[PDB]
């Protein structure tokens, strides 16, 4: 079970296909300004554009 915090601060959990430092590939763009709507937790994501 992995955890995450919603854009309004609420508490969610599950498989949660977010961003993790163990896995590479999903670095580009995740760090900078959040787009419209919402999918990614308020938890900050690693950077390393690469």
């Amino acid at each position: 079970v992995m955890q995450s915090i919603t854009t309004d601060g609420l508490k969610v959990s599950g498989s949660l296909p977010g961003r993790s430092s163990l896995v590479t590939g999903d670095e580009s763009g995740s760090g900078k300004q959040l787009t419209g709507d919402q999918y990614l937790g308020s938890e900050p994501s690693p950077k390393g554009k690469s």
């Binding site: 079970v1 995450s4 919603t6 854009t7 309004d8 609420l10 508490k11 969610v12 959990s13 599950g14 498989s15 949660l16 296909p17 709507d37 919402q38 999918y39």
Partner: protein, 87 residues
């Protein structure tokens, strides 16, 4: 999509507005709205993992202050082939 999204609350009103957030967020088909009891109300959705994630997350972002508010929005990515009677 077979991924199962799950979200629980207290009271039918937050559950049904969460179901609204489900049907307005992403391609998730609600397969069951059941009453646990003691005020606990359940809503399930079925879809693709990403769609399910976005939908459940939006539902959480929508249900926080609806009376009682959110209780649990924990989800899975694949139900087992046996859990269908339990669904």
């Amino acid at each position: 999509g077979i991924a199962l999204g799950m979200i629980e609350t207290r009271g039918l009103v937050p559950a049904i507005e969460a179901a609204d957030a489900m049907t307005k967020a992403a391609e998730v088909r609600l397969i069951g709205r059941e009453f646990v009891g003691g005020g606990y109300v359940t809503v399930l959705v079925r879809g693709e993992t990403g769609a399910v994630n976005a939908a459940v997350r939006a539902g959480a972002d929508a249900c926080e202050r609806v009376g009682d508010g959110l209780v649990a929005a924990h989800i899975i990515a694949r139900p087992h082939r046996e859990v269908e009677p339990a669904l």
